[PDB]
Amino acid sequence: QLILLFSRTALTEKCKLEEDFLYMAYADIMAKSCSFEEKEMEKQKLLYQQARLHDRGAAEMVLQTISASKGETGPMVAATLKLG
Amino acid sequence: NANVVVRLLIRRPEGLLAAMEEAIKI
Amino acid sequence: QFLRTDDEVVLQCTATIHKEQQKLCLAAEGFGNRLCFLESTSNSKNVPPDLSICTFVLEQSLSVRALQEMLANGHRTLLYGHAILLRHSYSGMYLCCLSTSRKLAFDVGLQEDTTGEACWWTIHPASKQRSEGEKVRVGDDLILVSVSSERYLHLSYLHVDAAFQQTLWSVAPISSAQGYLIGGDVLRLLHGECLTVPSGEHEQRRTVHYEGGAVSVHARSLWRLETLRVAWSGSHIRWGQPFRLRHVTTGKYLSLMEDKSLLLMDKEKADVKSTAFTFRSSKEKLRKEVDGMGTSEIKYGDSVCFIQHIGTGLWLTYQSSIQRKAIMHHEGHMDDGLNLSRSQHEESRTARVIRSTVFLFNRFIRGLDALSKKAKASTVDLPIESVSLSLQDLIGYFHPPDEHLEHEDKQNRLRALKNRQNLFQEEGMINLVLECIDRLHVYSSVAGREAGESWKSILN
Amino acid sequence: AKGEAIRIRSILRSLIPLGDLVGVISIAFQ
């Protein structure tokens, strides 16, 4: 539900982007959700957490908001890339 | 036999009710 | 060589009016006419045939039993004995029979829908040299038979209609590569800056400027290339092949009389060397015709196209509003092998609407100006039904989307609505409509009022 | 309740707009 919020706001063109501290909050929450066998289990534990996002449409939402903000290097965009 | 002849009768033409009364006097 | 689905073809005869090969091609109008007529191709050297309202797309070629089965609810090659779904390439509508008369003959035209046997057309060749079920090629004349009316595509006297008699129909291909110059395309022209034509309230806009800014994106900077090559006119553009040039927005022709200036004129002034222009790679004076779609010679964004008239041999450059007037100079500067960018489909679609929009209302305004006389009583030249038919279409053309649309689609419908409102703004067509509000606010109901009976409902 | 048998009902009656009271009345009263 929550990722379906931002994607629709990413598609409604406002010819610039706003701050949206709601989005700035939940981007970093998701971005904070990421010797052989002890290491190789972590690659599975990461790919579980990576799978949890990118099937819920979380893939293209970082792809969309980049395409919306054209040249603005605001903190809105920097919270996307840290999720990206 | 019905469909085949009337499809031919588009291809050939032959006021109809106008000249019908013209034969009533002539 | 062959014909499949999704090809671009036209339908043409030469109607023998007293031993005269009247080269008439089939042309529906759309967005203001649900009827069809013909376009002259005989004096193509001086009277330019329109093309965009004449080409067609073969959307499908199915058999008989398959069509009747689907009616109960790749690239397939054309076969004699197949019903095809013809489609108007400009309007997007489908060619169909109509239930009106102009005799038990029937009228032809476009329609919105595609179901029913009206938009379906089974093919039969009227030549014993070929036969049923085999492939259809170039130059294959035929009789096209309706499916609903079960009549033939009759050509009459000049009435394109559906009757119980036949008339042959030539078929000439137009086209079949992304990022390349294609014939018939609509395109911008990169200069720095772009080529532009002046704005409205006219001059008659007949000058030529060079300009950057928002009008590059906006309406006036639109150019539809047209060749003199009638068949295969949608082939891939190469250097030195002949072009006429029709302006999209004003509906005029970019003509050249180097005696006077660069001219913006109508059809009949646009003769051969009045406007025979070409493109070159260098700026020097160094094929001619190919019976195919050709090879993709010129790109879009990486291209150096040096414009040159055939009849005068000059090379167009600017002079020194930003009014760098493009004049056909003997040499010019090194800023004349310009760059290109094509436009998109709905951009071209509205642009083709606009020049068809104004030719109604100017006949509607001057139609009222003739009835603005105290006693004229003979001005039959006053459109009513063609106004009302075009009016609901434009009402429908700006219909906002419903709430029963997915949100990603609803933005695109909204983004289509925004640009199409923007083009009518910077054409100022509101003001054209605004004058019609003036000249229709005279009465309370008018004239000989039988034709002007919808004077209430037209105004609402 | 059939198919294209009603299509000939159109193409027949299209050539004949009615007018048949010539045939109905004008002879039948002699």
Coordinates of C-alpha atoms in Angstrom, one line a residue, chain C residues 42-402:
Chain C
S42 CA -3.3 14.1 -62.2
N43 CA -1.5 17.5 -62.1
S44 CA 0.8 16.4 -59.4
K45 CA 3.6 18.6 -60.8
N46 CA 1.5 21.8 -60.0
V47 CA -1.5 20.7 -58.0
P48 CA -0.1 18.7 -55.0
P49 CA -2.1 15.7 -54.1
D50 CA -2.7 15.3 -50.3
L51 CA -1.4 12.1 -48.9
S52 CA -1.9 11.9 -45.1
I53 CA -5.7 11.8 -45.5
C54 CA -5.4 9.1 -48.2
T55 CA -3.0 6.4 -46.9
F56 CA -4.4 3.3 -45.2
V57 CA -3.2 0.5 -42.9
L58 CA -4.1 -3.2 -43.6
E59 CA -4.8 -4.1 -40.0
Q60 CA -5.7 -7.7 -40.6
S61 CA -6.4 -10.2 -43.4
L62 CA -8.6 -13.0 -42.2
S63 CA -10.6 -15.7 -44.0
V64 CA -14.4 -15.8 -44.3
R65 CA -15.3 -18.6 -41.8
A66 CA -12.8 -17.2 -39.2
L67 CA -14.4 -13.8 -39.4
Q68 CA -17.9 -15.3 -39.1
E69 CA -16.8 -17.3 -36.2
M70 CA -15.2 -14.4 -34.4
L71 CA -18.4 -12.4 -35.2
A72 CA -20.3 -14.9 -33.1
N73 CA -18.6 -13.4 -30.0
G74 CA 3.0 -12.2 -37.1
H75 CA 2.7 -10.5 -40.6
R76 CA 0.1 -12.4 -42.5
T77 CA 0.3 -12.2 -46.3
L78 CA -2.5 -10.9 -48.5
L79 CA -4.6 -13.5 -50.3
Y80 CA -7.5 -13.0 -52.7
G81 CA -10.5 -14.3 -50.8
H82 CA -9.7 -12.6 -47.5
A83 CA -11.7 -10.0 -45.6
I84 CA -9.4 -7.1 -44.6
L85 CA -9.8 -4.5 -41.9
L86 CA -8.9 -1.2 -43.6
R87 CA -7.9 1.6 -41.3
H88 CA -7.4 5.3 -41.9
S89 CA -3.7 6.0 -41.2
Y90 CA -4.3 9.6 -40.0
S91 CA -7.6 9.5 -38.1
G92 CA -7.2 5.9 -36.8
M93 CA -10.8 5.1 -37.9
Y94 CA -11.8 2.2 -40.0
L95 CA -13.2 2.3 -43.5
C96 CA -16.8 1.1 -43.6
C97 CA -20.1 1.3 -45.4
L98 CA -22.7 3.9 -44.3
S99 CA -26.5 3.7 -44.3
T100 CA -27.1 6.9 -46.2
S101 CA -27.6 7.7 -49.9
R102 CA -26.3 10.5 -52.1
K103 CA -31.0 4.1 -56.3
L104 CA -30.3 1.5 -53.6
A105 CA -26.6 2.4 -53.5
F106 CA -24.8 3.0 -50.2
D107 CA -22.3 5.5 -48.9
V108 CA -18.8 4.8 -47.6
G109 CA -16.8 6.4 -44.8
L110 CA -15.1 6.0 -41.4
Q111 CA -16.4 5.0 -38.1
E112 CA -15.2 4.7 -34.5
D113 CA -15.9 1.0 -33.8
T114 CA -14.6 -2.0 -35.6
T115 CA -17.3 -4.7 -35.0
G116 CA -19.9 -5.6 -37.5
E117 CA -19.5 -6.4 -41.2
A118 CA -19.4 -2.7 -42.1
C119 CA -15.6 -2.3 -41.6
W120 CA -14.9 -5.6 -43.4
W121 CA -13.8 -5.9 -47.1
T122 CA -13.4 -9.1 -49.0
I123 CA -11.1 -9.0 -52.0
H124 CA -11.6 -10.3 -55.5
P125 CA -9.2 -9.8 -58.4
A126 CA -10.8 -8.7 -61.7
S127 CA -8.0 -10.2 -63.9
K128 CA -7.9 -13.8 -65.2
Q129 CA -4.0 -13.7 -65.1
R130 CA -4.2 -14.3 -61.4
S131 CA -6.7 -16.3 -59.3
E132 CA -8.1 -17.1 -55.9
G133 CA -6.2 -17.9 -52.7
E134 CA -2.7 -16.9 -54.0
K135 CA -0.7 -13.9 -52.9
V136 CA -1.4 -10.3 -53.7
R137 CA 1.5 -8.3 -55.0
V138 CA 2.3 -4.8 -56.2
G139 CA 0.1 -3.5 -59.0
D140 CA -2.6 -6.0 -58.4
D141 CA -5.9 -4.3 -59.5
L142 CA -9.0 -5.7 -57.8
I143 CA -12.7 -5.4 -56.9
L144 CA -13.2 -4.8 -53.2
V145 CA -16.5 -6.2 -52.0
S146 CA -18.4 -5.2 -48.9
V147 CA -19.4 -7.8 -46.3
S148 CA -22.4 -6.1 -44.7
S149 CA -24.0 -4.5 -47.8
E150 CA -22.5 -7.3 -50.0
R151 CA -21.9 -4.6 -52.6
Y152 CA -18.8 -3.5 -54.6
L153 CA -16.7 -0.4 -54.0
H154 CA -18.3 1.6 -56.7
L155 CA -16.8 4.7 -58.3
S156 CA -19.5 6.9 -59.8
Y157 CA -20.0 10.4 -61.2
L158 CA -18.0 12.0 -58.5
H159 CA -19.4 9.5 -56.0
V160 CA -17.4 6.9 -54.2
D161 CA -20.2 4.7 -53.1
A162 CA -21.3 1.1 -52.6
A163 CA -23.4 -0.3 -55.5
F164 CA -24.3 -3.6 -57.2
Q165 CA -21.7 -2.9 -60.0
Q166 CA -17.9 -3.0 -60.0
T167 CA -15.0 -0.7 -60.6
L168 CA -11.3 -1.7 -60.6
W169 CA -9.0 -0.4 -57.9
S170 CA -5.2 0.1 -58.2
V171 CA -3.1 -0.5 -55.1
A172 CA 0.2 1.3 -54.7
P173 CA 2.4 0.8 -51.7
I174 CA 3.5 3.7 -49.5
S175 CA 5.8 2.0 -46.9
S176 CA 6.2 -1.0 -44.7
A177 CA 13.5 1.8 -39.2
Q178 CA 13.5 3.9 -36.0
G179 CA 15.7 7.0 -35.8
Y180 CA 15.6 7.8 -39.5
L181 CA 14.0 10.1 -42.0
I182 CA 10.9 8.5 -43.4
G183 CA 8.7 10.0 -46.1
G184 CA 5.6 11.8 -44.8
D185 CA 7.1 12.3 -41.4
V186 CA 6.5 15.4 -39.3
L187 CA 9.7 17.0 -37.9
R188 CA 11.3 19.9 -36.2
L189 CA 14.5 21.5 -37.4
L190 CA 17.4 22.2 -35.0
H191 CA 19.4 25.4 -35.7
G192 CA 21.1 26.3 -32.4
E193 CA 17.2 27.8 -32.1
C194 CA 14.8 26.4 -34.7
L195 CA 13.0 27.3 -37.9
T196 CA 9.7 29.0 -37.3
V197 CA 6.8 30.7 -39.0
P198 CA 5.2 33.8 -37.3
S199 CA 2.3 33.6 -34.9
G200 CA -1.4 34.4 -35.7
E201 CA -3.6 37.5 -36.3
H202 CA -2.5 37.7 -39.9
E203 CA 1.4 39.1 -43.3
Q204 CA -0.9 36.1 -43.5
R205 CA 2.1 34.6 -41.5
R206 CA 4.0 34.4 -44.8
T207 CA 7.4 35.3 -43.4
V208 CA 10.0 33.0 -41.9
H209 CA 12.0 33.5 -38.7
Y210 CA 14.7 31.6 -36.9
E211 CA 14.1 31.3 -33.2
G212 CA 14.7 29.3 -30.0
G213 CA 12.4 29.4 -27.0
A214 CA 9.1 27.8 -26.3
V215 CA 7.7 28.0 -29.8
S216 CA 10.2 25.4 -30.9
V217 CA 8.3 22.9 -28.7
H218 CA 5.0 24.6 -29.6
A219 CA 2.7 24.5 -32.6
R220 CA 4.2 26.6 -35.4
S221 CA 7.5 24.7 -35.8
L222 CA 6.0 21.6 -37.5
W223 CA 7.0 20.4 -41.0
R224 CA 5.6 17.5 -42.9
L225 CA 7.9 16.3 -45.7
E226 CA 6.3 15.3 -49.0
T227 CA 7.9 13.9 -52.1
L228 CA 6.8 14.1 -55.7
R229 CA 7.1 10.3 -55.9
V230 CA 3.4 9.2 -55.6
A231 CA 3.9 5.5 -55.1
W232 CA 6.4 4.6 -52.3
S233 CA 6.1 8.0 -50.9
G234 CA 6.7 6.7 -47.3
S235 CA 10.1 5.3 -48.3
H236 CA 13.2 6.1 -46.4
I237 CA 14.6 9.5 -47.3
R238 CA 17.9 9.8 -49.1
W239 CA 19.9 12.8 -50.3
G240 CA 18.8 14.7 -53.4
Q241 CA 15.4 13.1 -53.9
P242 CA 12.8 15.7 -54.6
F243 CA 10.6 17.3 -51.9
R244 CA 7.7 19.6 -51.9
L245 CA 7.0 21.1 -48.5
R246 CA 3.7 21.7 -46.9
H247 CA 3.5 23.6 -43.7
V248 CA 1.5 21.6 -41.1
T249 CA 0.1 24.4 -38.9
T250 CA -1.1 27.1 -41.3
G251 CA -1.8 24.6 -44.1
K252 CA 0.4 26.4 -46.5
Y253 CA 3.3 25.4 -48.8
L254 CA 6.8 26.6 -48.4
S255 CA 7.4 27.9 -52.0
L256 CA 10.4 29.8 -53.4
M257 CA 10.5 32.6 -55.9
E258 CA 14.1 33.8 -55.7
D259 CA 12.9 36.8 -57.7
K260 CA 10.7 37.9 -54.7
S261 CA 11.4 36.0 -51.5
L262 CA 10.7 32.7 -49.7
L263 CA 6.9 32.3 -50.1
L264 CA 4.2 30.7 -48.0
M265 CA 1.5 29.8 -50.5
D266 CA -1.4 27.4 -51.1
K267 CA -1.6 24.2 -53.1
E268 CA -1.9 25.5 -56.7
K269 CA 1.1 27.9 -56.4
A270 CA 3.3 25.0 -55.1
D271 CA 4.4 23.9 -58.6
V272 CA 7.5 21.8 -59.2
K273 CA 10.4 24.3 -59.2
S274 CA 8.4 26.7 -57.2
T275 CA 9.2 24.5 -54.3
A276 CA 11.5 21.6 -55.4
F277 CA 13.9 21.3 -52.5
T278 CA 16.5 18.7 -51.6
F279 CA 19.0 17.9 -48.9
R280 CA 22.8 17.4 -49.3
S281 CA 25.6 16.2 -47.1
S282 CA 28.1 18.9 -48.1
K283 CA 27.2 22.3 -49.6
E284 CA 28.4 21.4 -53.2
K285 CA 26.5 20.8 -56.4
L286 CA 27.3 17.1 -56.8
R287 CA 19.8 8.0 -56.6
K288 CA 16.8 9.3 -58.4
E289 CA 14.0 6.7 -57.9
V290 CA 13.8 3.3 -56.3
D291 CA 10.7 1.0 -56.4
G292 CA 10.9 0.0 -52.7
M293 CA 11.0 1.4 -49.3
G294 CA 14.7 2.1 -49.9
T295 CA 17.5 2.2 -47.4
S296 CA 17.7 4.3 -44.3
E297 CA 20.1 7.1 -45.4
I298 CA 19.6 10.0 -42.9
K299 CA 19.5 9.8 -39.1
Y300 CA 17.5 12.2 -36.9
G301 CA 19.8 13.7 -34.3
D302 CA 23.1 13.0 -36.0
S303 CA 22.6 14.5 -39.5
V304 CA 23.9 17.3 -41.7
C305 CA 21.2 18.2 -44.1
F306 CA 22.1 21.1 -46.5
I307 CA 18.8 22.5 -47.9
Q308 CA 18.9 23.5 -51.6
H309 CA 16.3 24.3 -54.2
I310 CA 16.5 22.4 -57.4
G311 CA 15.1 25.2 -59.6
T312 CA 17.5 28.0 -58.4
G313 CA 20.4 26.1 -56.8
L314 CA 20.6 28.4 -53.8
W315 CA 21.3 27.4 -50.2
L316 CA 19.1 28.6 -47.4
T317 CA 20.6 30.7 -44.6
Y318 CA 19.5 33.3 -42.1
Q319 CA 19.8 37.0 -42.4
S320 CA 21.4 39.3 -39.9
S321 CA 11.2 39.4 -32.7
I322 CA 14.4 37.4 -33.4
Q323 CA 14.0 37.8 -37.2
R324 CA 17.0 36.0 -38.7
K325 CA 15.0 35.5 -41.9
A326 CA 15.9 32.4 -43.8
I327 CA 16.6 33.4 -47.4
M328 CA 17.9 31.2 -50.2
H329 CA 21.5 32.5 -50.4
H330 CA 24.1 31.4 -53.0
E331 CA 26.4 30.1 -50.3
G332 CA 25.4 31.1 -46.8
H333 CA 27.2 30.3 -43.6
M334 CA 28.3 27.0 -42.1
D335 CA 25.1 26.8 -40.1
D336 CA 23.0 25.3 -42.9
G337 CA 23.5 21.6 -42.7
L338 CA 21.1 21.6 -39.9
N339 CA 20.0 19.0 -37.4
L340 CA 16.6 17.3 -37.1
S341 CA 14.2 15.9 -34.5
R342 CA 10.9 14.3 -35.4
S343 CA 7.6 15.0 -33.6
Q344 CA 5.2 12.5 -32.1
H345 CA 1.8 11.2 -33.2
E346 CA -0.7 13.1 -31.2
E347 CA 1.4 16.2 -31.7
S348 CA 0.9 15.8 -35.5
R349 CA -2.7 14.7 -35.0
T350 CA -3.8 18.0 -33.4
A351 CA -1.7 20.0 -35.8
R352 CA -3.7 18.4 -38.7
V353 CA -6.8 19.2 -36.8
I354 CA -6.0 22.9 -36.5
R355 CA -5.8 23.6 -40.2
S356 CA -9.0 21.7 -40.7
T357 CA -10.4 23.6 -37.8
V358 CA -10.0 27.0 -39.2
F359 CA -11.3 26.3 -42.7
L360 CA -14.7 25.5 -41.1
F361 CA -15.0 28.6 -38.9
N362 CA -13.7 31.0 -41.5
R363 CA -16.5 29.8 -43.7
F364 CA -18.7 30.0 -40.6
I365 CA -17.7 33.6 -39.9
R366 CA -17.9 34.8 -43.5
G367 CA -21.0 32.8 -43.8
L368 CA -22.4 35.0 -41.0
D369 CA -20.8 38.0 -42.6
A370 CA -22.8 37.3 -45.8
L371 CA -25.9 37.1 -43.6
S372 CA -24.7 40.2 -41.8
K373 CA -25.9 42.0 -44.9
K374 CA -29.4 43.5 -44.6
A375 CA -30.6 41.5 -47.6
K376 CA -28.4 38.7 -49.2
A377 CA -30.9 35.8 -49.3
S378 CA -28.6 33.6 -51.5
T379 CA -25.6 32.8 -49.2
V380 CA -26.0 29.0 -49.1
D381 CA -22.3 28.8 -48.4
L382 CA -22.8 28.4 -44.7
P383 CA -21.9 25.1 -43.0
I384 CA -24.2 23.8 -40.3
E385 CA -24.1 20.0 -40.1
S386 CA -20.3 19.9 -40.8
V387 CA -20.0 22.3 -37.9
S388 CA -22.1 20.2 -35.5
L389 CA -20.3 17.0 -36.6
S390 CA -16.9 18.5 -36.0
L391 CA -18.1 20.1 -32.8
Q392 CA -19.0 16.9 -31.0
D393 CA -15.7 15.5 -32.2
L394 CA -13.7 18.3 -30.7
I395 CA -15.9 18.1 -27.6
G396 CA -15.0 14.4 -27.5
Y397 CA -11.4 15.3 -28.3
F398 CA -11.1 17.2 -25.0
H399 CA -13.2 14.8 -23.0
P400 CA -11.5 14.3 -19.5
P401 CA -10.9 10.7 -18.5
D402 CA -13.3 8.9 -16.2

